[PDB]
Design a protein around this motif. Structure first.
Motif, PDB file in Angstrom:
ATOM      1  N   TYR A  76       2.386   1.984  -3.512  1.00  0.00           N
ATOM      2  CA  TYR A  76       1.471   2.358  -4.582  1.00  0.00           C
ATOM      3  C   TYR A  76       0.532   3.525  -4.276  1.00  0.00           C
ATOM      4  O   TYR A  76       0.050   4.162  -5.215  1.00  0.00           O
ATOM      5  CB  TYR A  76       0.656   1.134  -5.043  1.00  0.00           C
ATOM      6  N   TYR A  77       0.292   3.790  -2.991  1.00  0.00           N
ATOM      7  CA  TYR A  77      -0.752   4.757  -2.633  1.00  0.00           C
ATOM      8  C   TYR A  77      -0.348   5.880  -1.668  1.00  0.00           C
ATOM      9  O   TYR A  77      -1.022   6.893  -1.614  1.00  0.00           O
ATOM     10  CB  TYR A  77      -1.978   4.022  -2.060  1.00  0.00           C
ATOM     11  N   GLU A  78       0.746   5.706  -0.921  1.00  0.00           N
ATOM     12  CA  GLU A  78       1.136   6.712   0.073  1.00  0.00           C
ATOM     13  C   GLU A  78       2.193   7.654  -0.451  1.00  0.00           C
ATOM     14  O   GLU A  78       3.010   7.295  -1.293  1.00  0.00           O
ATOM     15  CB  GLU A  78       1.656   6.037   1.318  1.00  0.00           C
ATOM     16  N   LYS A  79       2.091   8.913   0.010  1.00  0.00           N
ATOM     17  CA  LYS A  79       3.111   9.905  -0.126  1.00  0.00           C
ATOM     18  C   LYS A  79       4.065   9.795   1.064  1.00  0.00           C
ATOM     19  O   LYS A  79       3.651   9.478   2.172  1.00  0.00           O
ATOM     20  CB  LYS A  79       2.440  11.303  -0.093  1.00  0.00           C
ATOM     21  N   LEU A  80       5.346  10.079   0.825  1.00  0.00           N
ATOM     22  CA  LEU A  80       6.303  10.295   1.951  1.00  0.00           C
ATOM     23  C   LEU A  80       6.093  11.640   2.711  1.00  0.00           C
ATOM     24  O   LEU A  80       5.812  12.700   2.095  1.00  0.00           O
ATOM     25  CB  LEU A  80       7.735  10.242   1.437  1.00  0.00           C
ATOM     26  N   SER A  81       6.174  11.610   4.044  1.00  0.00           N
ATOM     27  CA  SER A  81       6.220  12.824   4.831  1.00  0.00           C
ATOM     28  C   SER A  81       7.499  13.586   4.528  1.00  0.00           C
ATOM     29  O   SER A  81       8.545  12.963   4.439  1.00  0.00           O
ATOM     30  CB  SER A  81       6.214  12.562   6.334  1.00  0.00           C
ATOM     31  N   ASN A  83       0.793  -1.207   0.000  1.00  0.00           N
ATOM     32  CA  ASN A  83       0.000   0.000   0.000  1.00  0.00           C
ATOM     33  C   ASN A  83       0.836   1.273   0.000  1.00  0.00           C
ATOM     34  O   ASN A  83       0.496   2.244  -0.662  1.00  0.00           O
ATOM     35  CB  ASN A  83      -0.922  -0.003   1.198  1.00  0.00           C
TER      36      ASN A  83
END
Lengths: 361, 366
Positions: B83-88, B80
């Motif tokens: 494919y779907y999360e941005k990095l902080s 997940n």
């Protein structure tokens, strides 16, 4: 006659038409609290409200310059630290009466100066006390505790709020804004046909559901929120063990549980990873004959429930839950579960999880 | 040499935990120093990328670490995440955890972090030569050795201990706790390790007492809160894989917003009890559900009310608890599975990891 889940499912089309016609005013209220944008959001919610947030999260993040963290509020209150990089907090409770959500917001209001928005179906409820603004999800009072229209309202309200936020913060232009509105309008137009298709699918496969001992729904990305609401709904109504799982999480334990009596739904969306879902469906279909697909637009066989519109994977959770709302109701009634006969009605108050008895028919 | 009747079982590895943990405790300062070499200016925001039992291990250690050090740990499923999360923008440290080092999700999620960000990356694994090492600045050994049973036990325990001890050392090294606290924590873990044999024996006594209630259990639930939610998730993973009936690990308050409505008189429900700000909430729920299923059990430390409580005979606080609180469930998973005739030495679905592209190679299983 007491309302049923079907009463509310049948009200979703008009409810969503109204939400889509009127979403800019709630979005403007939120925007006024964060006039320079808000890069880091925290959502505090539990149960179907948390599942709704999870269902809308990636749509919002796809359009707006926003990162959303979703946290269970009891855990958040007692065990989590507040991030110093937080720009907006949203608490979501359909009833506005879940003590964990209320109490978590109270903590944020006492400890930080960050803007706090409450999202609820009753803007005069207890959750409003600990928010700078309280917005209406647009459902009205839903008198069946196995929420259907209220879940859908929450998801749509969240998505459209993010849509408008993206537009107002110049992350998307007018064309994209309007094309998104058109997609949702087409999806709302497809609600009755979606109900009809689900009825047909249920009638076709009812003999497979009557004695099913376990249900599983597998999704990915945006549709993990749909799988979590499937779990919540099936657990509460059908009352056989039911699990909503991420596609790859499934591959690191749950697959070992599969037996030929598992009933497994595959939620298929167009994505960069659809090939992985196809591999897993083909593989598990060798071990259990009770497999089903829910997908948009196109179908290949009578074990696929085809939602007759197109939504991208980010938008999909708005409508992808609808078949499951219906199937939860129908399969529960098939099993003889008599859903208008309420159960454990003293629980919320006894457990200190609800401020008041449930206002349910 | 493959000898069919001499295969290791879950009990083999459970029985290796005590000695394994002594060695981990002896040597913990070395791994900790390796990690600390990457974050010399401090590290307040950590991301852990892990799946399965590795994720559950991270969840089991998280609040211990956050209680001692001014750090915030986010734990994310790696597929997940990729494919779907941005990095902080604010991330200071990424830790990838995979016991085998061969989980493609975890490997690929670290690759993304290595390609897109300059944040230091640590890998934690049982096999430092595995694929995961390519996408980390340093790769640390959890100390388990090779576990040739897929239903991991000692490896899970090694991961939780390694994370807790690493965080403990980090807290002490950075002067966030004093020498007295540091030494008192080492002593607490030493006592807990020494309590492994007695904990095994108590679990055996409990199992023997209640085995008739487990044989035809169609659904299991484990309920915890704060630190012990990680224990509940590992209960879910282990029971699902071995006992192979629906088995759920749940947060105490999450239970109150859907799962309570599923309860029926056949549910077998474990309550994980730790001393905490919120233990009264667990007591209320146990008393309430005991009216609607006769199949209730408690797992707790120190002392117990009655013979439906499994008493782990050492004093761990709620943050430390998940190190040892899993051990009874590892044993119960094994025993209940075998009671049900599930024949755990007979491998199932062995083509899955490679076919589904979730593992780089076939499992190395006895």
């Amino acid at each position: 006659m007491k309302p049923t889940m079907m009463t509310y499912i049948n009200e979703e089309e008009e409810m969503c038409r109204v939400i889509l016609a009127d979403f800019q005013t709630n979005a403007e209220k939120l925007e006024s609290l964060v006039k320079n944008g808000a890069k880091e959001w925290l959502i505090l919610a539990t149960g179907s409200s948390l599942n709704a947030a999870q269902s809308a999260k990636y749509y919002i993040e796809n359009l707006a310059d926003v990162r959303i963290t979703i946290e269970e509020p009891f855990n958040h209150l007692y065990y989590e630290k507040l991030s110093s990089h937080l720009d907006l907090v949203i608490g979501i409770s359909q009833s506005g009466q879940s003590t964990s959500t209320i109490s978590a917001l109270e903590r944020v209001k006492k400890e930080a100066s960050v803007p706090v928005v409450a999202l609820t179906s009753d803007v005069t409820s207890e959750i409003a006390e600990f928010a700078d603004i309280t917005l209406d999800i647009g459902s009205g009072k839903e008198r069946v505790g196995y929420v259907t229209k209220g879940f859908t309202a929450t998801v749509l309200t969240l998505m459209l709020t993010g849509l408008h936020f993206a537009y107002k913060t110049v992350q998307i232009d007018e064309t994209r804004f309007n094309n998104e509105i058109s997609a949702f309008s087409r999806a709302i137009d497809a609600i009755p046909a979606t109900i009809a298709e689900t009825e047909a699918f249920y009638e076709r496969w009812q003999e497979e559901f009557a004695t099913a001992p376990k249900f599983t729904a597998i999704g990915y990305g945006p549709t993990v929120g749909t799988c979590k609401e499937f779990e919540t709904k099936f657990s509460e109504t059908v009352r056989v063990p039911s699990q909503g799982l991420d596609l790859e999480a499934f591959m690191h334990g749950p697959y070992l549980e599969v037996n030929p009596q598992h009933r497994i739904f595959f939620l298929e969306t167009a994505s960069a990873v659809t090939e992985r879902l196809v591999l897993l469906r083909d593989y598990e279909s060798k071990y259990t004959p009770f497999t089903y697909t829910v997908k948009f637009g196109k179908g290949e066989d009578d074990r696929t429930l085809v939602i007759p519109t197109d939504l991208d994977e980010y938008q999909a959770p708005f409508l992808m839950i609808l078949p499951f709302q219906i199937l939860a109701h129908h399969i529960a009634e098939l099993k003889g579960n008599k859903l208008t006969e309420r159960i454990y009605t003293d629980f919320g108050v006894a457990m200190k999880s609800k401020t008041k008895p449930g206002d349910y028919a």
